[PDB]
Symmetry: D2
Subunit: 199 residues, 4 copies
């Protein structure tokens, strides 16, 4: 059973979050109870602050609180390569990857013909003007039929502009053995094999 | 990440249990696409939970009233107290609708190894509720600690004219013996019941 | 995979549950790497089980003799019979050391939805064992079917005169009511054992 | 558990990779309700596989014949030799279908420090196979030693007359970068194939 509406209210809102079911929401409400008021406030404020300060970048649509995203601003960043991505989280992933100092672009999603979701529900337009010649457009969308489809659509679109278009490497992940690697992956890791030495 | 709004929100979510760095970020970005209302409703529910929930003076169960629902209910059985480890168990024994007595929440459990003795236990409020003609049910967990907590309570509550009982160790609903530790099955036998 | 023998091992292994196509293969490549004695000692172990194992004609527990270990042990409470579903059950309750009586292995539970009635479980050879002055401990599982079977066995056995018990429902050792479902906690609270007079 | 045959069979089964004590006991009781024919057909496949399966003297795949159907099949690419760690890897690439070439089974990876130099693998009998006009595709995993063994084979083959290639390190099929390892994403970006030149 559940009575104090405040507790019933917290369980609900918490349970509305991804990766957190009813049982876990309650587990969470009873932990917030044991916490000092300073924290609850700081959690609440942090939530509210961000919701206010956080907006999408006008150039690329990476998340920020300024006129331009830190990536767009930063002058030491390779201004000639744009890495198209599905979600702002991928920017972090490809950023904490210590191997890319270029510009990013965020379609806030993936194409999907099924649900009438087209290149108008995704930030594909604001990308075109950013693409010029002597530039490279790395397509880093997912690898689901969605990511695969979005990318090929992007390739088609960007083609007329004079930039080099590339797609990230389909392949076996690091720290695995062929035995537990999916069939279609292997076939791609194979057909996409890199030559380490030419006689 | 760079904007303080994000970093701070992450920071504050990292704290919450069942959530680490990566989840916090995931969460934040999820909250980013929610309409303000959703956020406001989450912020208030937190604050309203803090401002309103408090321990029941009589049983220490979490409530918003001067007395918890169980305690303010006159149709409840005043002659039995089911001592439990966490407030979440009162919910669990209540969803059972099989119990109409009273509870009592220790907000913890004896943990010698982790330096937890009775000092950190809160029984002060329990003692003055157990007289004679009453039954106390130790619905403490069944771990090495729970069983301890019960033992502690037994020796503690027994001097009062109370009859102390313990939740039955047995096989759980939907259980298939083979997939049930021996010790438990051993108990499920010792405590079986005549159905004929 | 072309060598027919390799193929067969795969297919033969794929028949065992818990093991599937891709999993059979792995095992097969694991065997290939083992010495001849390992493989010969696994092979002979299968043929020896088949050849020497069979249900106890009295209680249907698994055994390699005319009557099972339990049934033949003189120092056993021939007064009580604990009924279980699978033979592995006798292993558990025995590995429990709390029981010193006899058993009866049904080899399954009643399952209406799967067309499994009493005729497909060794229920019949259990009736002639039950008489007045005995106790039948229905220790079938605690699932919906496991319960249904218990009830059924109870109605059948009752008139015979023996006393009948059901294993105690309850909280398992080493847990907390948090990660314990309500249903259980309900019976677990109801079947509480008094630990001290008033 | 007392019948020596049930025990002996559990022991032997629980030796198999993937099945634990519990799982093994379960397989035993399943073997129980099975007919001799199956038990003999299983025990048959085992001993049979031990008898007929051996390592091919060319590419060390697995076969009954004097030479693996792969090496034997004259309809395969005679120019490429795909080096894998395990025979399973063969069947693993012989699924994606995108390969008609030859293979070379190493039967393990390097991982030196724990005492496993190249002399314990089948690298030696690979050398003569490689020649000018061919391509050696190093298909070892991507574990630490997976990449290690590859880097060894590379340095080792360089001199021979064939080109060397390494399987593509990258993002698997059916995934989002959010749920994809750091270094993988990194090697994914560095190993990005351009698809539209300007
Ligand atoms: Zn930007
Ligand atoms: Zn109360
Ligand atoms: Zn017997
Ligand atoms: Zn061969």
């Amino acid at each position: 059973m559940k009575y104090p509406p405040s507790l019933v209210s917290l369980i609900r809102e918490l349970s509305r979050l991804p990766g957190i079911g009813p049982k876990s929401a309650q587990r969470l409400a009873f932990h917030l109870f044991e916490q000092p008021r300073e924290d609850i406030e700081r959690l609440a404020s942090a939530l509210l602050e961000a919701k206010r300060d956080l907006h999408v970048c006008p150039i690329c649509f990476n998340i920020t609180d300024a006129e331009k995203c830190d990536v767009c601003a930063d002058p030491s960043r390779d201004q000639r390569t744009i890495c198209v991505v599905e979600e702002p989280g991928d920017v972090i992933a490809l950023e904490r990857s210590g191997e890319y100092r270029g510009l990013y672009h965020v379609l806030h999603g993936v194409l999907s013909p099924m649900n009438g979701v087209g290149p108008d529900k995704l930030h594909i337009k604001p990308l075109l003007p950013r693409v010029g010649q002597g530039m490279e457009v790395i397509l880093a969308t997912g690898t689901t039929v969605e990511g695969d489809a979005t990318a090929l659509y992007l390739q088609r679109l960007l083609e007329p502009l004079g930039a080099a278009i590339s797609r990230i490497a389909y392949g076996v992940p690091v720290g695995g053995s062929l035995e537990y690697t999916d069939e279609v992956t292997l076939g791609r890791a194979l057909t996409g094999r890199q030559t380490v030495s030419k006689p």
